[PDB]
Design a protein around this ligand. Structure first.
Ligand SMILES: [Zn+2]
Length: 255
């Protein structure tokens, strides 16, 4: 599985039949159809105690991993019940500014999308949580090209150190708070992992407000490689999945 012509998303169903299931992700968010749900509580993002450990190129993206052994960086409230702990964050991006996001808003595509992955602490570990319908909560953040995002520069400067698949680098004292938009207004819907095994265990929380990054910052993303060191160079670009059928599900809005 990958994002090329021969292993791309249109092929994923052969090894992961769930790819054509009922609650697949990402999806187009139709703002005129989304239902404002007054019963929706404000998101509760507590990341002041976050502990980042490292960053790695897994051959389809780069992940910034976090120590999830204690309630240090947690998400609650919103449509959620209980506590979800931050385990990692990664991005999806394009070859040009016109594409790259997973979710789309009224069919508009962003230059990239940020996913903050969190797992429900009642299930005791990540691997158990993926087996549950309310097992994960993912915070989606859209990225538009404009002004630089100061809080993202620390991520950009280390990309050189992890150019190819399998490389990783110590990455401590990174504060996720520098990646959040001013508003916490969101859309939510039941869905799935955006990559294989594509398990339908996620409560998606997509924020309405995009963060802007500079052309120079996204450029640095486009320099990563899908290949391992010593293999022909395959730039890491367009690592995003096309929108899937909503099939009955309803998208609620907090605003
Ligand atoms: Zn993702």
């Amino acid at each position: 599985w990958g994002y090329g012509k021969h292993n791309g998303p249109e092929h994923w169903h052969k090894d992961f039949p769930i790819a054509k299931g009922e609650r697949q992700s990402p999806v187009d968010i139709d703002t005129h159809t989304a239902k404002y749900d007054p019963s929706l509580k404000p998101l509760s993002v507590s990341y002041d105690q976050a502990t980042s450990l490292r960053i790695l190129n897994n051959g389809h993206a780069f992940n910034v991993e976090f120590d999830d052994s204690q309630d240090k960086a947690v998400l609650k409230g919103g449509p959620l019940d209980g506590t979800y702990r931050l385990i990692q964050f990664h991005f999806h991006w394009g070859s040009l500014d016109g594409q790259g996001s997973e979710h789309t808003v009224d069919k508009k595509k962003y230059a990239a999308e940020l996913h903050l992955v969190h797992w429900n602490t009642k299930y005791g570990d990540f691997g158990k949580a993926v087996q549950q319908p309310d097992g994960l909560a993912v915070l989606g953040i859209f990225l538009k090209v404009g002004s630089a995002k100061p809080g993202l520069q620390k991520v950009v400067d280390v990309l050189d150190s992890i150019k190819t698949k399998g490389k990783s680098a110590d990455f401590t004292n990174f504060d996720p708070r520098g990646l959040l938009p001013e508003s916490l207004d969101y859309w939510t819907y039941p869905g799935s992992l955006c990559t294989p095994p594509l398990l339908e265990c996620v409560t998606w929380i997509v924020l309405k407000e995009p963060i802007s990054v500079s052309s120079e910052q996204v450029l640095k993303f486009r320099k990563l490689n899908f290949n391992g060191e010593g293999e022909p160079e395959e730039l890491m670009v367009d690592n995003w999945r096309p929108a899937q059928p909503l099939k009955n599900r309803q998208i609620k809005a907090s605003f």
